[PDB]
Design a protein around this ligand. Structure first.
Ligand SMILES: Nc1nc2c(ncn2[C@@H]2O[C@H](COP(=O)(O)OP(=O)(O)NP(=O)(O)O)[C@@H](O)[C@H]2O)c(=O)[nH]1
Ligand SMILES: [Mg+2]
Length: 171
């Protein structure tokens, strides 16, 4: 009664890339510099308004630590969308993207949508992955791409809005 659509979204990617911070910025417009790893999985709910429709988002923030790989992967079932995040200052996190893609292909719905996100783009002096490299990989994968900053609120809303739109279109 209260919404027109309800989408389960997951934020996945290596530990420390900024997944919790991404959700904190989107939902609460807040940021902390503290790094406290997520245990298991957590979620927030947010309702957005798009094309005179009410879209309820149930957004799951997954732990990136390998210790929680199995329990977070159990929640891929039923997800309509994924934010697949790496950190532009962490080459390992970028190298891990194909493995995350395989995990999505294995444990999610065939028609689940995916956006690749290179976070921490404010950290230009520590950057090791260029924008162009991120976009190149996204195009090889056939997915949309954004660089973001949870810290300075760059493109965070844009990612969620685009993900809602491509899920809606795929329907
Ligand atoms: N400069 C900068 N720091 C960021 C940004 N996003 C997150 N951080 C910092 O990166 C660290 C890890 O962030 P966090 O959101 O906890 O990462 P996570 O991906 O949720 N880690 P985990 O998978 O272990 O739960 C924190 O110190 C946080 O302040 C960003 O856009 N820019
Ligand atoms: Mg976290």
């Amino acid at each position: 009664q209260n919404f027109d659509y309800m989408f389960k979204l997951l934020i996945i990617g290596n530990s420390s890339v900024g997944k919790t911070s991404f959700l904190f910025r989107y939902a609460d417009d807040s940021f902390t510099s503290a790094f406290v790893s997520t245990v298991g999985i957590d979620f927030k709910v947010k309702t957005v308004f798009r094309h005179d429709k009410r879209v309820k988002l149930q957004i799951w923030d997954t732990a990136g630590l390998e210790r929680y790989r199995t329990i977070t992967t159990a929640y891929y079932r039923g997800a309509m969308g994924f934010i697949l995040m790496y950190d532009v200052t962490n080459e390992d996190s970028f190298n891990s993207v194909q493995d995350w893609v395989t995990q999505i292909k294995t444990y999610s719905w065939d028609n689940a949508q995916v956006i690749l996100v290179g976070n921490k783009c404010d950290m230009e002096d520590q950057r090791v992955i260029s924008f162009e490299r991120g976009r190149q990989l996204a195009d090889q994968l056939g997915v949309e791409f954004f660089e973001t900053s949870a810290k300075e609120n760059v493109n965070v809303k844009a990612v969620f809005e685009r993900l809602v739109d491509i899920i809606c279109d795929k329907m």
